[PDB]
Write an enzyme that holds these catalytic residues in place. Sequence first.
Site, mmCIF file in Angstrom:
data_model
loop_
_atom_site.group_PDB
_atom_site.id
_atom_site.type_symbol
_atom_site.label_atom_id
_atom_site.label_comp_id
_atom_site.label_asym_id
_atom_site.label_seq_id
_atom_site.Cartn_x
_atom_site.Cartn_y
_atom_site.Cartn_z
ATOM 1 C CD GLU B 62 -11.502 -18.584 6.302
ATOM 2 O OE1 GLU B 62 -12.294 -19.204 5.566
ATOM 3 O OE2 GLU B 62 -10.269 -18.542 6.111
ATOM 4 C CB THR B 136 -9.827 -14.593 13.663
ATOM 5 O OG1 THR B 136 -9.457 -15.678 14.523
ATOM 6 C CG2 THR B 136 -9.042 -14.686 12.373
ATOM 7 C CB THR B 170 -4.115 -5.617 3.325
ATOM 8 O OG1 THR B 170 -4.023 -6.250 4.608
ATOM 9 C CG2 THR B 170 -2.746 -5.637 2.667
ATOM 10 C CG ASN B 219 3.850 -16.606 4.950
ATOM 11 O OD1 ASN B 219 3.787 -15.613 5.675
ATOM 12 N ND2 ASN B 219 2.862 -16.967 4.144
ATOM 13 C CD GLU B 245 20.431 -19.822 29.755
ATOM 14 O OE1 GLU B 245 21.254 -18.983 29.332
ATOM 15 O OE2 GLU B 245 20.566 -20.417 30.845
HETATM 16 N N1 GTP Z 1 3.351 -11.962 6.299
HETATM 17 C C1 GTP Z 1 2.121 -12.382 6.024
HETATM 18 N N2 GTP Z 1 1.038 -11.687 6.519
HETATM 19 C C2 GTP Z 1 -0.219 -12.103 6.246
HETATM 20 C C3 GTP Z 1 -0.434 -13.230 5.471
HETATM 21 N N3 GTP Z 1 -1.767 -13.412 5.363
HETATM 22 C C4 GTP Z 1 -2.396 -12.435 6.054
HETATM 23 N N4 GTP Z 1 -1.449 -11.610 6.597
HETATM 24 C C5 GTP Z 1 -1.690 -10.426 7.437
HETATM 25 O O1 GTP Z 1 -3.074 -10.261 7.670
HETATM 26 C C6 GTP Z 1 -3.408 -8.894 7.593
HETATM 27 C C7 GTP Z 1 -4.852 -8.722 7.153
HETATM 28 O O2 GTP Z 1 -5.698 -9.414 8.041
HETATM 29 P P1 GTP Z 1 -6.698 -10.551 7.499
HETATM 30 O O3 GTP Z 1 -6.717 -10.566 5.990
HETATM 31 O O4 GTP Z 1 -8.078 -10.275 8.042
HETATM 32 O O5 GTP Z 1 -6.116 -11.941 8.073
HETATM 33 P P2 GTP Z 1 -6.226 -12.304 9.637
HETATM 34 O O6 GTP Z 1 -5.483 -11.267 10.440
HETATM 35 O O7 GTP Z 1 -5.684 -13.676 9.937
HETATM 36 O O8 GTP Z 1 -7.801 -12.244 9.959
HETATM 37 P P3 GTP Z 1 -8.857 -13.183 9.187
HETATM 38 O O9 GTP Z 1 -8.947 -12.817 7.726
HETATM 39 O O10 GTP Z 1 -10.211 -13.010 9.828
HETATM 40 O O11 GTP Z 1 -8.402 -14.617 9.301
HETATM 41 C C8 GTP Z 1 -2.431 -8.286 6.609
HETATM 42 O O12 GTP Z 1 -2.102 -6.970 6.986
HETATM 43 C C9 GTP Z 1 -1.214 -9.180 6.704
HETATM 44 O O13 GTP Z 1 -0.205 -8.538 7.444
HETATM 45 C C10 GTP Z 1 0.649 -13.934 4.969
HETATM 46 O O14 GTP Z 1 0.469 -14.934 4.279
HETATM 47 N N5 GTP Z 1 1.929 -13.506 5.248
HETATM 48 MG MG MG Z 2 -9.735 -14.977 7.671
#
Ligand code: GTP
Ligand code: MG
Lengths: 432, 430, 49, 92, 429, 425
Positions: B62, B136, B170, B219, B245
Amino acid sequence: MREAICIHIGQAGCQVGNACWELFCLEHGIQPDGSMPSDDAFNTFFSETGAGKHVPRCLFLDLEPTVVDEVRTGTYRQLFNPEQLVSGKEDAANNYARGHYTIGKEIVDLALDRIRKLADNCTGLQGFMVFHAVGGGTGSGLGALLLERLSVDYGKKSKLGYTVYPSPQVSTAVVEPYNCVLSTHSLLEHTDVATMLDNEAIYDLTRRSLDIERPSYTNVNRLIGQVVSSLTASLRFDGALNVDLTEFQTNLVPYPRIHFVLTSYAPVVSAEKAYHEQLSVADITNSVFEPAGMLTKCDPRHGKYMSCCLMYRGDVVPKDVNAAIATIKTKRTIQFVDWCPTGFKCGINYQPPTVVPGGDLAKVQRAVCMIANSTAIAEVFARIDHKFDLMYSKRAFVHWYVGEGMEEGEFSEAREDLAALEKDYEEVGAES
Amino acid sequence: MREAICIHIGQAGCQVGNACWELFCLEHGIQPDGSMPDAFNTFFSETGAGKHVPRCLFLDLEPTVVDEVRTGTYRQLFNPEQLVSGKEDAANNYARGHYTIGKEIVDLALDRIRKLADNCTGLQGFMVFHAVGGGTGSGLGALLLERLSVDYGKKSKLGYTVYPSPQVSTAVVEPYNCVLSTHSLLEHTDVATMLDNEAIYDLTRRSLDIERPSYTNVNRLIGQVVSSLTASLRFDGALNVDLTEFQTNLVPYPRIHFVLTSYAPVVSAEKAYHEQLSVADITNSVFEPAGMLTKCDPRHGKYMSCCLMYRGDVVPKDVNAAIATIKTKRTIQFVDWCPTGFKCGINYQPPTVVPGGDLAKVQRAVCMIANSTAIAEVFARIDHKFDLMYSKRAFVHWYVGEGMEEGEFSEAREDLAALEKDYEEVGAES
Amino acid sequence: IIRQHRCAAMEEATRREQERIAVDAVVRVQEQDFLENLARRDRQRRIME
Amino acid sequence: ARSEDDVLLAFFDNFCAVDGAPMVQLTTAEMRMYFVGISMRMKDDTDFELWCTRAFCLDRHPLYTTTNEEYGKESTSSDYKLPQHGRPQQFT
Amino acid sequence: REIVSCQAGQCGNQIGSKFWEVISDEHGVDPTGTYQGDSDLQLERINVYFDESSGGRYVPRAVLMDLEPGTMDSVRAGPYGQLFRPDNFIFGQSGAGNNWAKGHYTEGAELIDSVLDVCRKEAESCDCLQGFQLSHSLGGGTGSGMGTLLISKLREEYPDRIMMTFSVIPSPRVSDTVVEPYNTTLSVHQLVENSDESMCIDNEALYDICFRTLKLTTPTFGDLNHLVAAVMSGVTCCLRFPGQLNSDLRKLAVNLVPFPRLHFFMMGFAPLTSRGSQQYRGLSVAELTQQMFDAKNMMQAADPRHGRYLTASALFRGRMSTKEVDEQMLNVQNKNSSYFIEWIPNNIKSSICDIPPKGLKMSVTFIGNNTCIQEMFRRVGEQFTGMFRRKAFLHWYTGEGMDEMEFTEAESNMNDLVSEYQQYQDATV
Amino acid sequence: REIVSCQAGQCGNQIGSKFWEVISDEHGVDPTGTYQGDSDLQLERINVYFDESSGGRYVPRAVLMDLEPGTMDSVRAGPYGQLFRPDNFIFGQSGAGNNWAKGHYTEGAELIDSVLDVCRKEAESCDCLQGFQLSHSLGGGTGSGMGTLLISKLREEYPDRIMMTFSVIPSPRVSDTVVEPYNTTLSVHQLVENSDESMCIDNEALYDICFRTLKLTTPTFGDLNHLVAAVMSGVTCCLRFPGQLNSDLRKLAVNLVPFPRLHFFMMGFAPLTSRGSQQYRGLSVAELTQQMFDAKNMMQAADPRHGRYLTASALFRGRMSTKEVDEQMLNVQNKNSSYFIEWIPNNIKSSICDIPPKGLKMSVTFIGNNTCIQEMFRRVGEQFTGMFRRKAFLHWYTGEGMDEMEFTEAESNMNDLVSEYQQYQ
Ligand SMILES: Nc1nc2c(ncn2[C@@H]2O[C@H](COP(=O)(O)OP(=O)(O)OP(=O)(O)O)[C@@H](O)[C@H]2O)c(=O)[nH]1
Ligand SMILES: [Mg+2]
Ligand SMILES: Nc1nc2c(ncn2[C@@H]2O[C@H](COP(=O)(O)OP(=O)(O)OP(=O)(O)O)[C@@H](O)[C@H]2O)c(=O)[nH]1
Ligand SMILES: Nc1nc2c(ncn2[C@@H]2O[C@H](COP(=O)(O)OP(=O)(O)O)[C@@H](O)[C@H]2O)c(=O)[nH]1
Ligand SMILES: Nc1nc2c(ncn2[C@@H]2O[C@H](COP(=O)(O)OP(=O)(O)O)[C@@H](O)[C@H]2O)c(=O)[nH]1
Ligand SMILES: [Mg+2]
C-alpha cells in the site's frame, strides 16, 4: 570536409528534422540567427559563409505548405535559407500514386536542382540523410522519386534513411499499409541503409523510462534527433574509434539486399532518475540490449542478431566497451547468427550528448546508440504484409491509385517484392 | 566488500528501515541529501557523484509508507526506485500477501534484488526487516524468502522479525499470520531475531523513564541493535566478527536459528551519569531478564549460544572478567554440551547517540543475541493462540477465499509442534 | 539546475491551469440566457400593453 | 490591444472635469445621460443590451505532524562526523 | 488551398450563414469585414475561406443562391449579411415551391448559368483551389434538385476538384413537406454520381442532441445550426491552422472512401455538455473519446450499433498528446471490435490540429462511413415506393417535364445504393 | 485506494451531503471546489473521495439518488450543494410512496440503469477503486429498496471490491412510519449477503447522545448528521492520511468479520463533550478509551452488557503514543473478559493515524461487531411477524408486482441471522 546532406521529406520528415536541427545547433553552439559568438566541427552540417553566418546543409520538402511555412515563421527562420525549404500547393494526401506520378514530378526537378546546389558546395560529402515516414503519400511517393533520382544521378554515395514505418498496432491511416508496401520496393532498391522508427516502441519507451503521461510527437522527434546526432557525431568530433558513413555501413550491411536496421538508444532516462543511478558503461549497454529499450517494435528474442554497431559518446573507454561486449556475448538471452562470430562494431567519441532546453531527456556522462542488422525485421515486415494483403483482397482504397495514374499490377509487384524481403530474411537467418 | 543488503517489508519493515537508516547516516556522516559535508561501503553504494545510495529495498503493498518516504527528509537520499509499493494492501491476510496480491509485485521485488546484488561484489548477506503480525510482512515476506533462497542458495540471510506478543496484540488474525509465516521463517531464514514490542516497551518504561513510549523509540532501539550487530565489519576491533563468523557459532543445528536480543546499557541522560557503566555491570545488565528486547525469561530455559558484541572502550581483559563472573553466578544455566557458549566481538567505535532521541551517549555498550531453549515458551503461547482461534474456524474463510488451501493451516500447526518439540529435545539434559 | 528548471516548468503548467480556469469560468451562455430573459420580459410587457 | 488599466483610464477620462481633476461624485442623472449617449452610439437594441450587461454584469505545519517525520526532525548537519575508528586503507 | 462555398435553398442558406458566422468568429473577422483577431495565426491561412479586398475587407468565398428572394433578403439583413459580396447573391423571381422538377429543369435551369458564371469567377481568383462545398437540404425543391444541378455542372467543369456536399436529409418525424421522399430520391443519385463526398445530416438527431445532450429547453433553428456549423468548421481545421498531424479534404476522401460510390458519412461533434455541467465535467480527451462514438452525440439519426463502421476519422483540435489521442483510439477499436469491419483493421484515422475552437479547450469532429447509413435510405425508399405506387403528387413533375422513367431510374439507384451498403455489413473474410 | 460513494433516499441524501461537507472541510475544499488547505497531506491523498476535473476542481465521487426531486433540490440549495456534479443528481418524477416494492421493483428498477451507468463511469475514472460506500435508511421506501438493489448490482459487477453500507435503522421508541418493519426486513436480507460490511445507526441512540453526552438543548437532523459524518470520516481516515499503524477497508473487514454473514457493526465516536464540560475534560488516551467503551456514547440502541464483543476495532486519530493504547486495550480485555469472547482473546484491533479530525486534541472511532446487535433485529422481526400474521398493508406492496412469498423469505432470513448471532451470544 566530411559533409553530410540532410533531406527531410513530408510532414513527418519536416517535424523530425526540426528537432534534429535544433539539437545540432545547440550542440554546435550556433545561435538561431546563424552565428557562433564564442574548430571545423560544424563543417558537416553547416556551411560557413564569408559574412560569418552558418547555413544548414538541409532540404525540407512537403507538398503541403503547412510545415514549411511553420518553419519559415518559426524562431530559426534566420538560420534556415529562404531556398532549400521547398513547398507544394496541394498535398499527396496518403497517396503514393499522387506523390510519385502527378504532383511529385512537378516538384522533384526543383528538389534535384536544390540538392545539386547543396552538393556542389560540398567537397567531401559523406552521404545523404533522408528522413521520411512511408505512411504518408509524399513520404512514400515523393521520397521514392527523390531517392530514385538521387541514386541515378549521384552514383553510389552513402544514403541513410530514417523511416517511421507503419507501426503494427497504432496507425493514423487506413491506406498507410498500401503506401508502405508500395514504397518498400523503392526504399529497398535505392536506399543504401534504412533505419526502423516505428511508433509503439518509442512511445512506450517515453512512457516508462521518461515517466511522462503525455509523450507526444515532439518528444518522439527529439529522441530520433538524439539518435541521429549520436550516430553522426563520430565525424563531427574527435573520438578514440572514429567511424565514417562508409565505415559503419560496410560493417552493418552483410548482403546488398538486407540493410534494414533496428535502433536502440540508452541511457534514455528521466531527469528525476538521472543522478540517482550509477550509469556505468556496462549498465547502459545492458539497458540498450534489453528489448524494452529499443525504438522498434521487434523483440530481439524472436530473431537472430546479424551485425550490431554501438556508438558510444562521453567518457567511455575501450576497456568498458570490451567488458560490456564480453558480458553481452556471455549472456545467452540474445542470440547472434552463427556465421558472424564477432558481429560487433564499436565507435567511441569523447563528446557527450547535449540536451535541449525543455526536453525530457537528462544530460549524462555517457550514452550509446545501437544500430543493428538482425532478423527481427522479418516479423514487422510480415505484420505489415498481413495489414496489406487482407485489405487488397477485394480492392479497398485502390480506385484512388488506379485513377491517379498507377497501373493496378504495381500493387501485386510491391506485394511480391515485400514477400521476397521476408523470404530472403528467413533464408539468411536459417542455420547453415 | 562486506556489503549487507537490507530489505524492508510492510509497515514495521518501513518504520524500522527509516530508523535504522537514520542511525546509519548518523554513524557514517552521510547527509539526508546523501553527502559528506570507506567504512560505509557495507551499507551505502558509491556512485560517481560522491552521493551514497543506501543498499536497501523498501517493499510494500500500500502506497502510504513509500509516499511518506518519498516526501520526507530522506527523499534525496533514497533511490526513487528500490522504494516500491503496490496498489492495495494485503490487509492482514497471509493468503492475500502470499498468493494473490503479492505475486504481481514479487517479480519486480526480485528485479530490484538483482539490481542491489550486481552492484556489490562482496555481498555478505541479506537482512529483511519485517513483522509477521500483518498481512504483507507475513505473506510477501515469506514469498521473498522462498525466492531469495531459490535464487541465491546458501547466502547469509538474517531476518529481524517482530512476532506477536505473548500478552497483547494489535490484530485478531495476527496469530494466523504468525503461524503461517513461521514455516518459511524456519525453512529459508538462516538466522531469525525476535523483536516483539513488549520487552522493548518494558525496557523503555523501566530504564529510560519514558512515560509515552512509541514505535519511534521502539524502532530507534531496534536500529541501535542492528547497528551494533553490523558494526563489527564496519569498524576495526580487537575481535572482529562477520555474518558467517557469528552464524556458525550461534546456530548449533539448522532448525535452531531463532535468537533473543538484549542490548545494554540502555539508560536516559539523567540516569547515565550516576552509574559506573563498566564491562561487568553492562554484562550483568544484559543477562538480566529485564533488559532483553523479547518477552521471554531465560531462567525458564537453557542457553546454548550467546553472541556478545561490545562497542566502545571495552577491553578483552574486562570481557573475560565479565564472562568469568557470568560463569560463576548460578542464577543462569547453560546447556550441558556447550561449556564455552560465548562468542565475543569487540569494536572500537562507540554507539552514536541519535540526536533528539532517548538514548544517552555512553562510552561502552554491548548487544547480546542468544540461541536458547526459552523460545519454547513463546512458541507454546502462539500455538495455543492458534489452536484456540482455529478450533471453530475463526477468520478462516477470509484466508481460504484467496486461492488458499485449508490444509496448510494444519500443516503449519504441525510445524509449530515440531519446532517446540525439537527445542525441548535439544534442551533436554544428557 | 535541471531540477529547478523542471520545477519552474511545473509552475508554468499550474499557471496555464489557472488561466484555463479563468477561460472556463468565462465559458457567454449565461449572458445569452440573460438576453433571452430580457426578451421574454419585454415581449410580455408589449403583450400586456 | 490594450490592458485593464488602459480601459479603466480611457473610461474614467470621459468623466473628468474641465480643469482635468479626476471627478469622483456622480449621480443618477449623469449616469443616465452617459447611458443615453451610448444608446445613440449604437442603435441596435440587442447590441445596446449586450453592451450594458457586458460592461456592468447585471445578473452575473503545527496541526499536521507525522511520527515518521519525527525521525530526522531534529538532526542537523552539525551532528554528522565520520567514524574515528574506521577500516584501514584498502590495499586491494 | 482555397475552398469555395455555395449555399443552396433556404436550409442551405441559413446553415451556410451560421457556418460563415462560426468561421468569422474563429478567424477573428468582424461582421463589418475588418479583422479583429487575437493573433497572427488567424491571418496566416485566412485566404482559404476569405478573399482580401483593396481596403482590407475579407469577403467570404461564398455564393448564396436560391430561387426565393425572401431568404436572400433575410440573410442580407442578418447580422453578417454585410460580409458577403452582393454580386454573389443570385436569386430568381418565383420560388420552386418544393418542386424538384421546378428547381432542376424550368426555374433553376435558366439561373444555374449565372450561378456557374459567378462560381468560375470566384474560383479563378484562387491560387490553388482546394474545392467546393455545397450546403443544402435534400427535402426541399430548389435546395435539392437545383443544388444537384450545380454539383453536376461543377463536376463537368472541374474534374479533379473535391465537392463536399452537406445535405440535410429530411425525416418524416420532423416532416415539413409531403414531397420529401420524391425530392430525396431524385437527388441522391445525382449526389452519388457527381459529389465526391455527400455528408448526411438528420434533423431528428439534431433535435435529439439539443434535447438529451445539450439540454436546451427551446433549441431554435439557430441552435440546430450551431452543431452543423461546428462540424463544417472542424472538417477543414488543418487546412487553416497548423497541427502535429495535418489533414485535408483529400486526406479524408482517400482514408474514408474505400469504394467510389461509398462516400456517405455521418457526423459527430465533441464535446457537448449542458449549461450547468460545463465547468463541472473534466474536459479531458478520455471523456472526449467516451462521448465520441455514442449515438446521442451523433447528429445523424441512425443508431451506429445496428451497423458496422467501414471507416472513420477523428479530427482533433487542441494541445493533446499521441498517447492521449491514439492509444485510446485503439482501445476503442478493441473494446468495440464487433462494430468495426475485420477486413480493414484500424478502421479509424486520427488527425491533430493545434488551434482549438474559440473558448473550448479541446474538441474533435467525427467523420464516419458506416453500414448504418442505409437505414435512412431504406426507410425513405419505402415512402417513395408507397407514394409512387399510386402516382401521387406526380402531375406536378410530369407537367414540368419529368417522365416516370426518371423516377423509376431514381428508385433503381436508391436500391443499388442500399444494396451496396448492405453487402458490406454481413461480409466475412 | 479511492472510495466511491452513493446516497439513497432522503435520509441517505441528507446524511451523505453532510458527510461530504465535513470531508470538504477536513481536506480544505471550499464549496467552490478549489483547495485552500494548510498542509501538503490534504492534497497528498485527496483523490480518495474527490476527483479532479480538467480544472483541478475536486468534484465528490458521489452518486446521489432519490425518486423524489425535493431532496435533490434541498441538497443542491445546501451550502456545499454546488460542489457535486449535476449528472450524478439522478432522480425520478414520482416518489416511492414509502414503499420498498416501489423502490425496488417498479420505479427503482426502471431508474437503476442510469444509476449503474454513473457508478461504472466513476469506477472507470477511479485508478484503483478501494470500494463502494452507500448511505441510506432501511426504514424508508426509496432509500431501502433503491440501496438494496444498488448493493446487489454492485456486488454482481465488482465481486472483490469492498462494500460498505451505512444503514439508519429505525427503533420502536422513535418510529415515525408504520412500514419500517416491512422495509427493514426486506432490506436486511439483502444487506446480509450483498454487503461486505454494514454499520447500523439509530436515531433513538443518536438523540440520547445529543441529549446527555452533548448536553445540547435542540440538536436536529443536522446534528445527527454531524455525529454520523464524524464516523464516516473516521472509518476511512487511514486511507487518506499516514499513521503509525495504518488500516483500510479490507483490514477492518478481515479483522471484524469472523464469519461471512456476521458483518453488522455497532458504532461509537469519541470524544464528545459540551461547551460547559469541554474545559473540564482532560483529554487523554485512557479518557478516550473509557468514553468510547461506555454504552451511552455508542449510537446503537443495544446495551453492551446484554451481549459479548465478537470483534472490536478502535481507529485512533491524532498525535499519540502506542504504548498507552496498547495498555488500554490489554487492561480493558483483562478487566472485562466477561464482556469479551473467550475463544478469541484480544478481540480488539487498534489502528493509529497521525492526522486528527479538526476540532480535537485527538479522537477515535469504534467499530463494534457485538452480539447485542441481534436485539434490534429480534424486535423488528417481532414487529414484522405481528403485522404479517394479520396481513397488514400487504396489498400496497403486492400491487407493484410483488407477492407474499418474498416477505415470507425475508422474515426467515432475519430470523436465522438472529439465531446465528444468538449462537455465539
Ligand atoms: N516495533 C514495531 N512494530 C511495528 C511497527 N509498525 C507495525 N508493527 C508491527 O505490525 C504488527 C501489525 O501488523 P500491520 O499493522 O498489518 O503491519 P504489517 O505487518 O507491516 O502489515 P501491513 O499493515 O499490511 O503493512 C504489529 O503487531 C507490530 O508488531 C513499528 O513501527 N514498530
Ligand atoms: Mg500496511
Ligand atoms: N516519428 C514521427 N512520425 C511521424 C511524425 N509526423 C507524422 N508521423 C507519422 O508518419 C505518418 C506519415 O506522415 P503523414 O501524416 O501522412 O504526412 P506525410 O508523410 O508528409 O504525407 P502527407 O500528409 O500526404 O503530406 C503519419 O501517419 C504519422 O503517424 C513525426 O514527426 N515523427
Ligand atoms: N438545420 C436547419 N434546417 C432547416 C432550417 N430551416 C429549414 N430547415 C429544414 O429544411 C427543410 C425544408 O427545406 P426547404 O427550405 O423547403 O428547402 P428549399 O425549398 O429548397 O429552399 C425542413 O424539413 C427543415 O427541417 C434551419 O434553419 N436549419
Ligand atoms: N439520523 C437521521 N435520520 C433521518 C434523517 N432524515 C430522515 N431520517 C430517518 O429516516 C426515516 C425516513 O426515511 P426516508 O428518508 O423517508 O426514506 P426514503 O423514503 O426511502 O427516502 C425517518 O424515520 C427518520 O427517522 C437524518 O437527516 N438523519
Ligand atoms: Mg502532410
